Symmetry: C7
């Protein structure tokens, strides 16, 4: 009938029972509070139940191994296996968390905004919204593309509508017999007659290369980002009309045939 | 005949025996409960037996090293090797768990739904269902494709049927001798006569480029996503018929041959 | 001649000797049991000996460092190096364990079965069996391909024989002079006369595009997965025969030569 | 009515209550200070609230598990799960932190500066600014590109405007009948007559290869980085004019046709 | 002149000296035993000396930090740095250990054997032997290729000689004017006259496609894996001879030239 | 009024206050010393301030948690979160540290030196200097390329100027009618007449292949690395001149036209 | 004036002072020994100084935190940060250590030797030496390539000179009108007349395919690895000479032109 060690053992076992009971009731309270909060807002039944079950099971495991440790059973192996499971689930959630962090960065720094034409890794379209995990944009064709934010933060972000002024690049191919001065002066007159082409920017009309069947002139003109395509179409049509009127010919693929026998 | 230290040693050895016995019976109870639950639902015999064997062996290892620690043998090396094995199995299950997390995200955010035409990384087809690990979709050809959810969350998710209105893009190539005004007016009449082409959207009929053997006109018209292909086919057939009737010719690959000798 | 501390030291050294002796005999018993079990079933001599040697050496190392700890020599460095070795071997076995987990998933969810034509990442063939580490399939050519299960779970799994009905796609190219109505009516008659083409599915016969040297008609017809190739061959042969009989010509690569000098 | 152990237990419980109360008030003070600092500067409401909530919850968790440890409940499992969560969030923030470190390196070593034409992994444009996470540059076309700093530090950094002098490379293709000496002397005269071509650098005019339809001469001349394109255009135009005047012909694609029947 | 604490300090210092002396002599004994074993078998001098030096230095470090811990100096930092070094060397040896594990798997499951023609990731040749780290195979050209076992376990393993029967695929292109029935009957007679072509397998002779300049027939016949190439050559030669005798012509690349001017 | 435990508590609290005060003053001294050292050399203000702030905050956190531990509050959670942050920052700095280690290796082993023409992963140019993080080289075009040292250590390092002697490879294509003996003897005479071509090395003049329109001779000659390009140009020019003088013709792309109708 | 606890505190502080003094002197001795050893052999000044500084700073940090622990300040945070730094530097040195391990494996197993022609991942050349970190080989062109050993162990190692006998593969294309028997007998006579072609190996002369403009014969002959190229050149030249003498023609690209208008 020991009085010191037996009393210590009784204190330990009563403390372990109190620990497990308090852990059970605290897990119940936490689960009830989480269920109340998930009821207070929009949530999915299956995911909410899975999350509450995982939280409750985690708390129950914590209090059970705490009670075992208070009793005197070593729980280092259980802690190691729990750490392994936590590392596995962290590696599993690495992709989702990286997308979330990238979305936070995109919201903060604002590389692009809603209604702003962009090019995120080869796909281009008007941005509609930037969610936490992925942005959604509508292409010029009309289809909706959802791009994860991690793949947006990684790689370049071309922004077409950030700069108010953009440049067109015409590549006109005329025959070798065509007069260089006449071609240059016709193209210069066409560029000057246009009103939506900015005159304070560079207006290049130069002979760019000597091709296989034609000499390729290059025309580079700057215009406001909203008139770029219309200017391109109008200038191309006027180039064709004036070249046809002036006798300048666009050559077909040339070929020299050395006839034998 | 010591009374304090010998009593402590006896308490320790009896506690170790109690720990190992209780561990054995608790492992038996847990295995029986898991077997009962797996019987209560659909399960595979081999996988169920492997899982129960792994769980029982884990519990037995836990209680054995707990008994060794209570006796006095250090078990830190066993715990380290068990942690290494847990890390190895976590890295092994990383892919499956990532697929599971991606499936949960796809169910929650609903980037696509059943019966919705999509394009998940180059493969396009009607989605049939979204499971926990992988979705299955039927392509237009009729074959079934199973895509892991991780590879769906990673990369773009093109959704063709999300937007009710989509755009067609015709590229008509006519000869250089063809009249630009006549071609444009014929294409405009063809577009206007169509009823499934939305008139409140942009209807582009412009000269897009000067090709090697033809001048390429571009026609862009918007229509409801359900009439897109039929509108494309009807407009193409009418374009050919009206161009043949009006004398506009679609040129063959042109070539200028400079005859020598 | 101390009686307390000297007795404690004697107890510690005797306990260490008992620990090392019991570790040796337990390692011998475990090795004998493992050897008996490996004898009871099919096993390879070299791999079995290597595994038994590794297990015995691990147990011997465990009991040796346990004896050192009981004596009083700190073994934290040995435990750290053992953990490093365990992590290295876990990273080494990561690929094999990932293949094993993927094989378990493939057996459970059954994306494909034995005797089912599939396409696992670009290679297509009839599945023969699904082992734990890798499946083996015979291609239509007759060669056997062994694909690791991890590379099967990763990436798409196209299943040709899952859906009973599949679609053919004929691309017929006829000359520009050919009558569109006559071509369409001939193709429609050929499709209707076929009995293995399902009549309740869509039967598309439309002008698909205006090519460089021909107008490309598209024919899409559905049939049971077992008659797909035979239907394709029969329809193609009948298309050629009827086009030759009706005067419709398949054009050779066209070219316009503008003769000069 | 014990006086030693009961007093120790009372001290422990009072200390735990003091620990939790002081943790609560210190968390409140830290949150108030962080809120004051975020008010003192520009910040976003949602991100600021999320960061303050995370910091406060972390401090509350710390003080709660400290109080539990002071009471006597083992918290090793909670610490292991917290470490797993910290590792997961560290892996999530790995990309952003790598971009930040790369930005620091780019600011320090200055591989490129604002207003300096560069080529960062295939995209070339004038650098506008180098932020902490990503630099922004305007291409010659006029579009703005935002490149993450990690992808800039990785891979080559071509700098066009670092070196004051750059080299042009003309590839002139003349007919096989053309006189090599005459072609070389004409090209040499054209190069010598140019004033923006540096005369102290190498001026190569050599026959580079015998092509399929022409003999390709190579002209390499050095000029200041600001006159490179203008020199290229002027030299090309003068080359064409002088070759046309001197009778040297640029051959069309040659072909020998062996006529049969 | 304390008798308890001073005696404890003397015991600790004498124990530390004994620990370091025993560690030195045990390191000497282990090094001598390892040197004797390496002498007993084939070994390289430099690698053997490096391995023995590493083992001896590891044991010396272990016993030195054990002596420091017994003295009373904390060695947790040394243990942490040693763990970091162990993790670094484990990551370094990850590739070699993965190759070793893959070699063990290849030996066990036997995906291929010596003298068996295979295709390991694009390279094909007769397997000579499978070592622990890499297999060596001789290609049909005669060069020896050594493939690491990890890269063999990863990716497909095409085995040409596993299946006794393989299929040939002839693609014959004949002119559009050729009689389909005559071509099919000639090919069928050629296939039937062959003795090494299995008659119980499928023997396909069908019109496969309508090409640009020819109609492509397809012939598929099965034969034993040892007669595949000889059957291919003999059937091809007989096809050419019989088509030349029967008047069937293999067309040259066709072209329609629309002469103008 | 306890005298033992109360005195112990007073000692602990006074020790904690001393620890925090000494930590504060030591942090101040370390920050002052680091600031003095950064003043003594070139440094950037922002980076220096950030580094000093990080060091001071780290020391303050260390001494604060040390004071908490001395008081009696468990700090294992704080240590775990600090370890997670350290691992995150280590993964962030992994790329920079790998570049630094690669730079150290490049400086030590000297795979290339300043002023030595190299080819580091597809980009070739004269090396200017090798810094700690990245080398900079000037290409033959004149642009400066900065390559991170990690990407240099990874992958091949082609060194053009390491070997004093290099080989040219001429591919001459002559008509099928050309005399093989005459072509070989002319090429041999041209090679022999050259003085910068080493005569003790192999001088190959052989018929390499039968091409589609020409028979391709191969000429391989060795020369000093400084005369390689000049020898190539001179030999090519002499080859053309002597072939034109001797009647050997370089054929244009040949084509046999079988005229029909 | 306590006699027990005060004496213990004095012992602890004197022990801490002794620990720090002995750590300082041991660091000095180790640095002096390392400097002496680095003087005794070839070393670089900057790298040697950096390594000695790192070693001395590590030892100083170790002894400082040991003294702090002996005093009573908890150093777990310092140990955690030191472990994080060690992990970061281990990840940094992962590439270099992997190259070192691969070099050790290459030296041991000897996949290739000095003076042995190989192909290490697409680059082929004669191996000069195999260092610890990277091998260096001279290509047939004459340039020196340094390949890291890790990238050599990874991927295939084609060894051209391991097998004494290698096979040539001639692809001769003759006109469709050519006699198959005559072509085969001429090629067989040419192969038989050669003395460096092994007669005990297979000597294939078969019709390989029916090409677009020619029938392609295949000739496969084995020869010693040293005579392979000379045999190829001699056989090719004799093939051309005998085909020209016998009237067999090598056809130019054929084309059937269907003339219209
Ligand atoms: C795969 C990933 C792995 C990540 C790393 C995992 C490391 C896990 C380390 C676990 C350490 C547990 O730490 C230790 O646990 C045991 C319970 O088991 C606690 O308790 C133990 O010792 C105390 C000492 O007073 C005893 O009263 C108690 O009966 C006993 O169980 C210890 O007080 C604690 O220090
Ligand atoms: C490869 C991945 C590695 C991940 C990290 C792994 C770290 C492993 C650390 C294991 C720590 C074990 O922690 C320690 O274990 C021993 C048993 O061995 C326990 O027990 C030990 O010390 C107690 C002290 O009272 C003694 O009564 C007991 O006889 C003895 O065995 C300790 O109370 C516990 O603190
Ligand atoms: C590279 C991967 C690294 C992964 C992480 C590795 C962490 C390794 C941590 C090892 C911790 C060992 O934990 C500790 O070990 C020593 C033996 O060395 C044990 O024993 C030590 O302290 C006890 C205290 O009573 C003494 O009686 C004993 O003489 C002494 O050796 C401790 O009871 C245990 O707590
Ligand atoms: C997934 C990533 C994992 C990374 C690695 C994680 C390792 C986690 C190891 C946790 C170690 C905790 O360390 C241990 O914690 C317990 C509380 O639980 C503390 O406290 C415990 O033992 C002390 C001993 O005096 C008791 O008074 C106290 O009642 C008890 O709770 C110990 O003093 C401390 O040593
Ligand atoms: C970068 C990778 C990092 C991987 C993880 C590394 C974790 C390293 C943890 C080391 C833990 C060491 O564990 C601890 O070590 C010290 C020595 O330093 C031992 O010893 C210490 O405490 C004992 C307590 O009785 C004292 O007698 C002794 O004087 C003192 O040095 C402890 O008994 C042991 O518990
Ligand atoms: C995400 C990456 C994670 C990497 C791994 C991280 C592992 C972290 C393990 C921390 C271990 C801390 O180790 C433990 O800390 C507590 C403080 O908290 C110290 O102190 C604790 O126990 C001592 C025991 O005498 C008490 O006096 C003190 O009041 C108490 O706070 C312990 O003496 C020390 O052993």
């Amino acid at each position: 009938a020991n009085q010191a060690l037996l009393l210590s053992y009784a204190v330990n076992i009563v403390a372990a029972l109190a620990i497990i009971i308090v852990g059970l009731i605290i897990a119940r309270m936490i689960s009830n509070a989480v269920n109340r909060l998930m009821i207070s807002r929009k949530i999915d039944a299956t995911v909410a139940d899975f999350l509450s079950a995982l939280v409750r099971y985690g708390i129950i495991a914590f209090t059970l191994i705490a009670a075992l440790g208070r009793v005197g059973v070593q729980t280092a192996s259980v802690i190691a296996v729990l750490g392994a499971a936590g590392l596995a689930v962290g590696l599993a959630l690495q992709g989702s968390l990286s997308n979330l962090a990238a979305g936070v960065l995109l919201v903060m720094f604002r590389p692009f905004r809603a209604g702003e034409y962009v090019d995120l890794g080869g796909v281009a379209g008007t941005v509609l919204s930037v969610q936490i995990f992925s942005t959604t944009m509508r292409t010029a064709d009309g289809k909706i593309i959802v791009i994860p934010n991690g793949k947006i933060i990684a790689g370049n972000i071309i922004n077409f509508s950030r700069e108010p002024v953009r440049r067109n690049e015409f590549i006109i191919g005329v025959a070798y017999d065509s007069d260089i001065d006449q071609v240059k002066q016709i193209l210069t007159n066409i560029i000057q007659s246009e009103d939506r082409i900015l005159k304070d920017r560079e207006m290049t009309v130069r002979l760019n290369e000597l091709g296989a069947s034609s000499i390729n002139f290059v025309v580079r003109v700057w215009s406001n980002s909203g008139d770029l395509q219309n200017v391109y179409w109008d200038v191309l049509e006027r180039i064709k009309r004036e070249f046809d009127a002036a006798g300048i010919s666009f050559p077909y693929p040339q070929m020299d045939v050395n006839f034998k026998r």
